[PDB]
Subunit: 329 residues, 4 copies
Amino acid sequence: AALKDQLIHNLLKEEHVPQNKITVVGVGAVGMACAISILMKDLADELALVDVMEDKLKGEMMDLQHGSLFLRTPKIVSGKDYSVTANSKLVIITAGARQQEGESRLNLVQRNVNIFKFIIPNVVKYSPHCKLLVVSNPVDILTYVAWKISGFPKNRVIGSGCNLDSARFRYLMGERLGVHALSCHGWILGEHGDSSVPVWSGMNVAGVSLKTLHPELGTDADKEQWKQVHKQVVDSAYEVIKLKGYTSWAIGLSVADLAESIMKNLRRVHPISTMIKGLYGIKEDVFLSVPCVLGQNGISDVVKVTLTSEEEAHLKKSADTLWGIQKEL
Amino acid sequence: ALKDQLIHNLLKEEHVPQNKITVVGVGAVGMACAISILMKDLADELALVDVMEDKLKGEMMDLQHGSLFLRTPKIVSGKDYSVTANSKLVIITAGARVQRNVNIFKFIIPNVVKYSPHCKLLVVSNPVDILTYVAWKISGFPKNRVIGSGCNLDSARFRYLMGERLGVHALSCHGWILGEHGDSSVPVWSGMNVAGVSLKTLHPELGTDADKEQWKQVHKQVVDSAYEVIKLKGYTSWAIGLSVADLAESIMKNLRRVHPISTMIKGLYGIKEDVFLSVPCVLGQNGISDVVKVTLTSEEEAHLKKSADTLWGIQKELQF
Amino acid sequence: ALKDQLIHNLLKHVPQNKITVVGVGAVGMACAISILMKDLADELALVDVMEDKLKGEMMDLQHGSLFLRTPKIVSGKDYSVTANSKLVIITAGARQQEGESRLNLVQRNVNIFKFIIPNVVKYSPHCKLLVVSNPVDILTYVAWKISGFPKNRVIGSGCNLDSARFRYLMGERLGVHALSCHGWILGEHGDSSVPVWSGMNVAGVSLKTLHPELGTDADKEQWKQVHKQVVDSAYEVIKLKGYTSWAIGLSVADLAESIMKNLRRVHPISTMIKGLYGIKEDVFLSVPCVLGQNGISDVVKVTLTSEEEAHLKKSADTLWGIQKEL
Amino acid sequence: AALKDQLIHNLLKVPQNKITVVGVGAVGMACAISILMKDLADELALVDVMEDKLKGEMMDLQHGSLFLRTPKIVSGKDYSVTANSKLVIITAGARQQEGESRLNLVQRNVNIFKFIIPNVVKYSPHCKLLVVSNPVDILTYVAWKISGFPKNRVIGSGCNLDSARFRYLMGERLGVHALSCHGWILGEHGDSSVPVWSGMNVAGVSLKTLHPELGTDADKEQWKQVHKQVVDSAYEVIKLKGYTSWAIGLSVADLAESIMKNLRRVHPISTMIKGLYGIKEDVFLSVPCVLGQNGISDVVKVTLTSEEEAHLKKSADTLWGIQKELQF
Ligand SMILES: NC(=O)C1=CN([C@@H]2O[C@H](COP(=O)(O)OP(=O)(O)OC[C@H]3O[C@@H](n4cnc5c(N)ncnc54)[C@H](O)[C@@H]3O)[C@@H](O)[C@H]2O)CC=C1
Ligand SMILES: NC(=O)C1=CN([C@@H]2O[C@H](COP(=O)(O)OP(=O)(O)OC[C@H]3O[C@@H](n4cnc5c(N)ncnc54)[C@H](O)[C@@H]3O)[C@@H](O)[C@H]2O)CC=C1
Ligand SMILES: NC(=O)C1=CN([C@@H]2O[C@H](COP(=O)(O)OP(=O)(O)OC[C@H]3O[C@@H](n4cnc5c(N)ncnc54)[C@H](O)[C@@H]3O)[C@@H](O)[C@H]2O)CC=C1
Ligand SMILES: NC(=O)C1=CN([C@@H]2O[C@H](COP(=O)(O)OP(=O)(O)OC[C@H]3O[C@@H](n4cnc5c(N)ncnc54)[C@H](O)[C@@H]3O)[C@@H](O)[C@H]2O)CC=C1
C-alpha cells in the first residue's frame, strides 16, 4: 500500500475548523509585505490569499509555501474564490490602484470604490464575524466605504490609517534626538495623507514635553524647523514612490503591528482610522485616525486627546477634506 | 537646540557595529533576505548596496520607516562599499537573473573584501555553485569563509512537498538534496525519514521508475519549482529570503547546525577538482567548520561526481 | 473620573487562545514563563490549592506584563478562572525525593487527579489535556479514564524531554547542535525508556550504519552510556538542586506550540497505544505522534529491531502492572 | 576510527555575544531563562558559590538546548567560565529590602561583592555590569568602585521594574495595555522613589492635565496610592510566595536586549549621576538613561518641580552618608 499508510496510523478523521485564520486580499506589493510580516510574527495558524489573477496568486502562494520549513504557520492557501477566506478572524484589504509619481491618494477613490463594491460583499459572505482592516488608498474613505457596504458595526471596520505616519514621524524624531523610535512618542492624526495633523503638544521622551522645552516646536518661527519633520512625513510616500515606484515594507510591518494587537487582544492604543462622528468637533460620518484601543473586538474605545485649538483646527480641516470626497459617493 | 535641552551626553561614542550584515543587490531576492534578517533580529546594523541608486535609497527609506516595529537600530545604504565596513556577514544577491555575473563579481568582491576582510561571504546569485567558486578565487578567503546558499532551499522545498504528501509538517520530514543547485541536484533517498524511520527501507521502490507512487516526481517538482514560480509571478523571492536568513542565523549565533550548502569540496566525496557543491555542512561563526560524510549509493556517488565534472567544465571557461 | 475623561467607550470577553496551568510549583511556573515568552496564549490561568503562593505567582507574572504579549493572567483555587481553555496542563502533585522512582508517586497523585480532572472538564470540556505530573504515563491514563475525553485529547509530556536530553548529549559528543542530531527515546518516561538506535542520525546518515554495534554492550565507544545518562538525568539533577524545572518547562512549551498553532509536528509523547506495536492493553507510553489543534491525530509506526521491540513491550509490561491495580 | 571522525570531516580548527549571570538563585535563574528565551546570547555562563546547586541549574538548562538558540551554557565557581562576556548580571547576595539602609545589613552584601566583582573584571574587563542585588543603588556604587569601570559601564536595575509595575497598575485602572501607559518612577529605589506625575500619559495625553489633583492627598481617586502600591508590591509578593523572581527577570532581560542590540532606548535605571540634577556626590540614582552597546551614554533631563528636585538631592545626601561608612 501507500507509503503514508505504511508509515502513519491515522487515529482521527478531522474536518478543518480554523482557529486563528487571517486573509489578505490582494497579492500585490502591499499584500505580500503584509503576508510575510504576519508569517514572520506567528500571528495566524492559517493564512489565506485572494486575488483576481490566478497565476500571480498561485505563484505567490507557492513561494511562501516553499519556506514552510522556516515558519510556524502550517496552512497557507489561496484562490480566486472567496470560499478560501471563509471563517477568518481578520481580513486585510490591500486590493486597488496605487499612486503614480506625484498623484494624490485621493485621486484613487473612483477606481478603488468600485473595486470595494466587488470585494467587500464577498469578504462578508464568508467571514461574517471578522474584523476588516482596510489598507487600500485613500484609506480613510475606503474604510468608510467598507463600513457602509459591509453593514458591520463600526468597531469591526478599521483603517490602517496613521499607524504608519506615526511610525515615520517617530523614526525621524529619533534620528534627530539620538534615541530609538520606540522611545520617541508623538502622534500623527487625521487623514493618512496630505492633511495629516502632528500633535506637537503631546510629543515627549520619557514624559518630558518637547514643546515645553522648545516652545517654538511646531511653529514657523522655530529656528530648528521641526515643522519640516512633519512635512517629511507627508512627503515620504511620494519620495519613496519616486525612488522605487511604490512603498511596501513599512506598511507591511505597520499592518502586522495592528494585526498583533487584534489577534492577541492586546488593547494597545494606535492611531488608526475609525468613524469619528460626535467626537473632536466632527458632525459627519467621516473616518480618520485618532488614538484607538485595539483588540480582539476591534476598536473598543477612543482616546480623547487634548488638542490645542490649532491642532483641533487642523483636524477639523482634515475631516472636512475627507467629507468633501465622502459626500459625493 | 531641542536635543541638548532634552539630553545630556555623558559619553563620546565611536560607531563600531558588533553584529553587522550587508546585502549586495536590493532586487527581489536581496530585499526578501533583508526583511527576513530584520524580522529575526539577527543584526544590529544592516547595510544595503546596489548600483541603481534611486532604487537603493527608496528601499532603504522604506525599511527605515518601519524601524519602530523592528529591533535593528541602524539601516544604511550606498553605492560606495564604505557603508559595508566591518560586516560579519556579506550576502551577495546581485546579478542578472554566468559570464555576466562573473564580470559583476569582479567589481563587487574586491570591494567587499577591502572593507570587511574578516567577513563570511554568502553567495546567492546564480549559478550559485559557480559564483561561490568565483567569489572564492577573487576574494582569496579560506574556504571556510565562502559559502553558497546552494541546496538549502532545494531541501526545504523537498521537505515541504514530502510533508504535504505525508500529512506532517516539513519540520518533521527529513530529506537531503545535495550537489548542484537546480537541474543536476541529487535526492538522497536513503536518508529520507520521519521520526528516524527510513522511508526507503519501508518503501523499497522509493526513488525508482517502478514506484507506483512516483516519489521520484517529487524531486522533479523540486528541480522544476523555480521555473514554475518564475512562470507564474516572474521571479522567486520569499522562500530564498527565509532560507538565507536561516543560514544567517546559524552563522550569527554560532549554532553549528547542519545545512546543505555549497562548499569547496575537493578532497572529499571522491572529488578532485576545486569545485563547490552542496553537502551537509556544520555552520557557525567561523563559517563552514566541518562537513558530514554521507553514505551515498554507488551511483548517487557517481551522480555527484558528474556534477563536479559539469561544474569544473564551466569553471575552466571562466575569464576573470 | 479620569478614565472617562481620557477614554470614550464604544463597546460593552471570550478568550480565543487560553491556556491553564494546574499546579504553580517548580514545574508549573517553568511551563508558565516559557509559554508566556513564546506568545502562545491570549489568557493564562493558574490554579493551585495553596492560595497564598498562587496569588503571589500570579502577581509576580502580572508585574511583568509590560514585557509580555499575553494581556490577561488570572488565578484561583476555584476552577472557574480556567473556563474556555484550549489547553490545560497538569503539573500538580508529589515529586521524587532523591533516589525515588517516579512510579512510587502514583498513589498520591491518582488521589489528587480525582479532584483536579473533573473540575478541568467542567470548565473546559473541549480542551486538550497535557499531563506532566509523574508517573506521567500512568497519570495520562488516569486523566483519560476520569475525564471521559477521547484519546486524541489526553496527552502525556512523555519522552519529549528524554529525547531532548538524548539529543543534547549526542550533539555534545558529535560537535553539532541538538537540532541537527536526531534520535528517539520511546516507552516509559523513566527507567524503562527505549532508545531507538536504528533511527539516530545526522543529516540522514544513520550512526548505526557507520557503527553497527552502536548502543550495544559490544560498543567500545559506550554510546549505551548516553542513554543511561538520560535515564539518570532526573536523579542527578534532583540530587544537585532538589528538583528539575527548566527543561520540562521548555519541553511542555514546545508541545504547547505544536498544539496551539496546529503544526502537525511529530513528537515522542505518551498516548493510548493499544493495538499498535503489538500491545493489547490500555497502556499509555511514548511513541512518535502527530500533534496539532485536535491533539494526537496520527501515530508513526516505527520499525524496531527485535531487541528494541522487546524493550518496549517490557516498558509496556512495567506499566499496566501498575495501571491494573488502580 | 571514532564514530565522530567517520561521520564528520573536520575542515577547521571566542564567543561574540556572551552573557554571565552571577548568583543562580530565584532572581538569577529568572534572568537566565528570560535571556535564553529572547535569543540575546550565543553563550551563557553561570557562577555561584553553591557548587551542587550551580551544576544542577546548568544541567537543567542544558537539557533544554533543543528548544533554544543559545548553543553553549557553562557554569562554575571559578570565574574562568565567564571570560569574554559582553554583559555580567549580578544577582548574588542576601535578600534585603529595596531601600535597605541599616549599615550592618548593607555591609554583608558589600562583602559578597568584594569577592565577586574583581573576579568578574579579571575575565571580562570590557563588559557592561548590571547590578540587581539589594540595596541596589548602594551596591551599584560599590560595584563601580571595586570594578574600576567607567561609569557608562555600570548599571543599576534601579527603578526599571518599579516603572513597569506602575504602568501595569495604570493600565488596569484605565483599561489599556501597560505598553500604552507611560509613567516614570525615578530616584532612589524603594520608599524614597519619586513618581513623576507630570509625565504620566496615554497617547501623549497628560493625566495630570485631565486630573490636576493627580498625585495629591485631596485626589479622590487616590492615585498617590498607586505609588505606595508600587513601593510595597515586592513585599506583598514575598509575603505570598516567599520571594520575587519573574517580573525582575523579565525587566532585566529587557535591559539586556537594549544593551546587546545597541537599541538606545530610554529606561529608568540607576546611573552615576554626579554633575547632573544638581547632585554633587558619587551616587547612583535612576533617571531616564539611553542604554546601548556601551551602556549608559546619555541621560534625559526631566523637568522636575522644586520639590521633586529636593527629593533627589536628599536621596543623594543619604546614599552618600551610608557609602562613607562602608568598608571595602
Ligand atoms: N499606508 C497605507 O495605507 C498604504 C496603502 N497602499 C495602497 O495599497 C494598495 C495596493 O498597493 P500595491 O500593493 O503596491 O499595488 P499592486 O499594483 O502591487 O497590487 C494591486 C492589487 O489590487 C489587486 N486588485 C484586485 N482587484 C483589482 C482591480 N479590479 N484592479 C486593480 N487591482 C486589483 C491587484 O490584483 C493586486 O493584488 C494601493 O491602493 C495603494 O495606494 C500603498 C502603501 C501604503
Ligand atoms: N536559491 C538561489 O540560490 C536563488 C538565487 N537567485 C539569484 O539571485 C539573483 C538576483 O535575483 P533577483 O533579485 O530576482 O534579480 P533583481 O533583478 O530583482 O535584482 C538584481 C539586483 O542586482 C543588482 N546589481 C546588478 N549589478 C550590480 C552591481 N555591479 N553591484 C551591485 N548590485 C548590482 C541590480 O541593480 C539589481 O537591483 C539572480 O542571480 C538570481 O538567479 C534567485 C532566487 C534563488
Ligand atoms: N518530564 C516530566 O513529566 C516531569 C514531571 N515532574 C512532575 O511535576 C510534578 C510537580 O513537580 P514540582 O513542580 O517540582 O512540585 P512542586 O512541589 O514544586 O509543586 C506541586 C504543586 O502542585 C500543587 N498541588 C498539589 N495538590 C494540588 C491540587 N489538588 N490541586 C492543585 N494543585 C495542587 C502544590 O500545592 C504545589 O504548588 C511532580 O509530579 C513531578 O514528579 C517533574 C519534572 C519533569
Ligand atoms: N527588584 C529588584 O531589584 C530585586 C532584587 N532582589 C535582590 O536580588 C538578590 C538575590 O535575590 P534572590 O535570588 O531571591 O536570593 P537567592 O537566595 O534565591 O539567591 C542568591 C544567590 O547568590 C548566591 N551567592 C551568595 N554569595 C555569593 C557569592 N560570593 N558568589 C556567587 N554567588 C553568591 C547564593 O548562593 C545564592 O545562590 C537579593 O539581594 C535580593 O534582595 C530580589 C528581587 C527583586
